[PDB]
Amino acid sequence: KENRWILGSGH
Amino acid sequence: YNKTVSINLDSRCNASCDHCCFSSSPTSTTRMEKEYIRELVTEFAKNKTIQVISFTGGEVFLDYKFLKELMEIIKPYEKQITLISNGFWGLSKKKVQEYFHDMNSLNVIALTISYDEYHAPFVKSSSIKNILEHSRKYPDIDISLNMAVTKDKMSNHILEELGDSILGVKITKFPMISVGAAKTRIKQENIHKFYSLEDEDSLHCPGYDIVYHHDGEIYPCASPAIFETKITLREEYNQSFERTVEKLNSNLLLFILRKEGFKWFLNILKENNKIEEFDIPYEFSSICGVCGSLFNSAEKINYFYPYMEKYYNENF
Numbered sequence: 553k554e555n556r557w558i559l560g561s562g563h
Numbered sequence: 564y565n566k567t568v569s570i571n572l573d574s575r576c577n578a579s580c581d582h583c584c585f586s587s588s589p590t591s592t593t594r595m596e597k598e599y600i601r602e603l604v605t606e607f608a609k610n611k612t613i614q615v616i617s618f619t620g621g622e623v624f625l626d627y628k629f630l631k632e633l634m635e636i637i638k639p640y641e642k643q644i645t646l647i648s649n650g651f652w653g654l655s656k657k658k659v660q661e662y663f664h665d666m667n668s669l670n671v672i673a674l675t676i677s678y679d680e681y682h683a684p685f686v687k688s689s690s691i692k693n694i695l696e697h698s699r700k701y702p703d704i705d706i707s708l709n710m711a712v713t714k715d716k717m718s719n720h721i722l723e724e725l726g727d728s729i730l731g732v733k734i735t736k737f738p739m740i741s742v743g744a745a746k747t748r749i750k751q752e753n754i755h756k757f758y759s760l761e762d763e764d765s766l767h768c769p770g771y772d773i774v775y776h777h778d779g780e781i782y783p784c785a786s787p788a789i790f791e792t793k794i795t796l797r798e799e800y801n802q803s804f805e806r807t808v809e810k811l812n813s814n815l816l817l818f819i820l821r822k823e824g825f826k827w828f829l830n831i832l833k834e835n836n837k838i839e840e841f842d843i844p845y846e847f848s849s850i851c852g853v854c855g856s857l858f859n860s861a862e863k864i865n866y867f868y869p870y871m872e873k874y875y876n877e878n879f
């Protein structure tokens with residue numbers, strides 16, 4: 553998702 | 564928007580990708596002071612509402628001792644951590660073993676690895692494979708592979724050369740945001756265009772996510788496009804997270820953007836014949852591309868002020 557583009561995110 | 568927070572640790576990177584939204588390189592000097600970052604991390608760890616702290620850059624593993632020290636400040640408070648990296652450190656399997664052991668003992672719930680044709684001149688394919696393969700031993704860490712692509716560089720061979728190391732890994736190929744090095748080093752004809760000024764009913768921001776950026780400012784999201792805008796949530800050097808959240812929730816521009824979408828701002832520019840004057844692009848790779856072009860100067864933001872004031876008096 554765009555709002556968390558430059559970040560690691562859980563599935 | 565107070566359950567997650569991100570810190571951009573530094574603009575310094577071992578790579579110098581031609582698309583980089585921050586133009587990161589080994590000689591990049593933009594960063595917040597280390598002691599200031601220790602204080603932000605301590606505050607976020609002590610905060611009762613924050614559940615997830617994310618680190619980004621730049622390359623966060625470049626100064627690993629400082630990253631591990633920040634992860635250790637958070638440890639007694641049991642907050643979840645996410646990391647994103649170019650995986651340069653994957654060159655050594657022993658180094659990979661050490662870092663996965665640390666991430667697992669420091670509540671790192673997600674690791675995103677970026678690899679594509681733009682990252683390839685700086686990191687070997689084998690380094691990425693080492694990280695992807697060892698991650699199988701840590702099923703509680705959600706692993707992702709992010710690939711930034713253009714029409715001339717679609718990363719079709721990168722994926723084949725990664726072999727079976729990508730099995731079970733979530734892969735997302737995404738287009739470029741025309742910011743930073745992508746503005747001058749990539750031909751605009753090579754950036755995919757999925758949206759136009761006419762399909763405005765699809766231009767809605769996916770949601771806010773607070774980022775304390777390496778330029779010392781605070782942004783309402785982590786999209787590459789936001790960092791070129793003048794939308795900041797910082798009003799002073801020592802600002803609490805409660806104040807940051809209060810400002811995000813009382814920002815009239817961001818409230819109007821969330822409730823009405825980009826078409827509210829685009830229709831004002833069309834009505835007043837300011838599309839050419841503001842250099843609004845006709846086509847774009849994503850919804851964030853409109854965002855950047857509407858608000859990437861103080862003149863542009865201020866321009867909307869009387870219309871936002873009228874909206875506030877009419878509604879509320």
Ligand SMILES: Nc1ncnc2c1ncn2[C@@H]1O[C@H](CSCC[C@H](N)C(=O)O)[C@@H](O)[C@H]1O
Nearest residue numbers: 558583584620621648677709711739740745
């Ligand atoms: N102009 C741009 N458009 C789209 N994605 C971009 C971009 N500039 C950088 N990115 C992506 O933003 C993500 C975080 S960049 C910082 C983290 C790290 N150096 C890394 O490379 O992962 C990376 O996946 C990168 O490819």
Ligand code: SF4
Nearest residue numbers: 576578580583621649
């Ligand atoms: S995209 Fe990531 S690895 Fe490439 S220059 Fe930017 S910060 Fe460094």
Ligand code: SF4
Nearest residue numbers: 555768784786851854
């Ligand atoms: S750049 Fe704009 S549209 Fe994209 S995530 Fe950030 S606030 Fe939302």
